[PDB]
């Protein structure tokens, strides 16, 4: 079957400027490939068909264009309604492929994470339960990593993470990691401490605490 | 004009089966195709097949035979899909498409949203996490909830900067949510912060504020 390829999965763009997302089939897809666009919980539109003919209800800042194999779609004057996954389709032949899809993103400065520990809520470790909770906010690019330690001993067992779309205000991101467990075990170590590897640091940003005070 | 009307979001246990419906309006029916997409998060956009009403005569990717079923009612104007034996795959946002004339796909359904799980209604736990003992950054975590989604404020939804509220993520079959407020440390305690959590689905609606430990 016809695969379709998206390199970038990722690109940083920023308003008022030119933005071309890549898409290469891996057999002669002739110019039958079209192109969609998709917002966060919203259905797919169609911006282009026969990989250079825009379909109606379209800025102009959208047009496509292919090469042999190698299909283009191109955003000038890029503008923060065009923040979206365009995926690119081909019609060649049976079965229909998709690209993997390209999410635009508007570039900044970086910034480090602020990071912030939470332990358990007395209200949770009455009912029996520990969670610890650590916030890394408005930080930039979106690329990051978190470590949990307990007493120096790291543990990947049990811990949940979640991540903010970029922030359409600021620019940036921000994450989420819950380390869960069962209050014995929570109740038998003393130092509980949670690490952040980011581009913005030489030094891994480190918060901690210790159980009881 | 022509216009496609799915049916409404669906939850079914592992095993069972799923009907997804489609009312395609503003146009001859039966002459044109519908086309089925996937959309799985991390999974892109996937084609299911197609069917034309006119002989319900039916096109399936080769990966969904037996999956997927494809069914016209031409006096209705609606077509239907079912999903047999479903499960964690299996859960998605489903699309119905109309192409133009034959090929590219130029009407599109809003969607229909299928959750698989074993989970049973669930009223999430709403745990206040107030900092260790200039600014300060505040925290509500919701626990263990289903189904999707909840809604949470803070201060009635009157505070509303400096908060971050964390897309929901599975744990041990149930949903967990957190979100954060920052406010300037000279605000709180000071002033009373509170976090409001609600839950239209076990009509769970909770209000806690965050104290200093
Ligand atoms: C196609 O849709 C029509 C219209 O809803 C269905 O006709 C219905 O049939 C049911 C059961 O026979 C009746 O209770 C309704 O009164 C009918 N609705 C109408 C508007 O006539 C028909 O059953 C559907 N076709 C099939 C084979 O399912």
């Known amino acids: 079957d016809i695969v379709m390829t998206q390199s970038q999965k990722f690109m940083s763009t920023s308003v008022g400027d030119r933005v071309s997302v890549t898409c290469k089939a891996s057999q002669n897809v002739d110019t039958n490939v079209a192109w969609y666009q998709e917002k966060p919980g919203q259905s797919p539109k169609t911006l282009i068909y026969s990989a250079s003919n825009r379909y109606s209800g379209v800025p102009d800042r959208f047009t496509g264009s292919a090469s042999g194999t190698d299909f283009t779609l191109t955003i000038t004057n890029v503008q923060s309604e065009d923040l979206a996954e365009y995926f690119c389709?081909?019609?060649?032949?049976?079965?229909?492929?998709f690209g993997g899809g390209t999410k635009l993103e508007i570039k900044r400065a970086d910034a480090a994470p602020t990071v912030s520990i939470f332990p358990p809520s007395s209200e949770q470790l009455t009912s029996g339960g520990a969670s610890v909770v650590c916030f890394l906010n408005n930080f930039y690019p979106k690329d990051i990593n978190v470590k949990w330690k307990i007493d120096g001993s790291e543990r990947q067992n049990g811990v949940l993470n979640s991540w903010t779309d970029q922030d359409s205000k600021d620019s940036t991101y921000s994450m989420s990691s819950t380390l869960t467990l069962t209050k014995d075990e929570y109740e038998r170590h003393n130092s509980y401490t949670c690490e952040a590897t980011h581009k913005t640091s030489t030094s891994p940003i480190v918060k901690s605490f210790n159980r009881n005070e | 004009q022509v216009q496609l009307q799915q049916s409404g979001t669906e939850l079914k246990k592992p095993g069972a089966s799923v009907k997804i419906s489609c009312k395609a309006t503003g146009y001859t029916f039966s002459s044109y195709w519908i086309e089925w997409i996937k959309q799985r998060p991390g999974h892109g956009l996937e084609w299911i097949g197609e069917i034309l009403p006119e002989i319900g005569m039916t096109n399936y990717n080769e990966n969904f035979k037996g999956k997927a079923t494809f069914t016209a009612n031409t006096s209705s104007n609606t077509v239907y899909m079912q999903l047999s034996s479903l499960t964690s795959e299996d859960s998605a946002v489903y699309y119905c498409?109309?192409?133009?004339?034959?090929?590219?796909?130029?009407?599109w359904g809003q969607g229909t949203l299928v959750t698989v799980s074993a989970a049973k209604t669930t009223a999430p736990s709403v745990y206040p996490l107030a900092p260790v003992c200039s600014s300060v950054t505040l925290g509500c975590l919701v626990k263990g909830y289903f189904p999707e989604p909840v809604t949470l404020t803070w201060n009635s939804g009157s505070l509303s900067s400096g908060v971050h509220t964390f897309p929901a993520v599975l744990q041990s079959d149930l949903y967990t949510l957190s979100s954060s407020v920052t406010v300037t440390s000279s605000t709180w305690p000071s002033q009373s912060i509170t976090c409001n959590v609600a839950h239209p689905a076990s009509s769970t609606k909770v209000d806690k504020k965050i104290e200093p430990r």
């Open positions: 498409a109309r192409p133009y004339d034959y090929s590219w796909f130029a009407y």
């Open positions: 389709q081909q019609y060649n032949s049976y079965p229909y492929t």
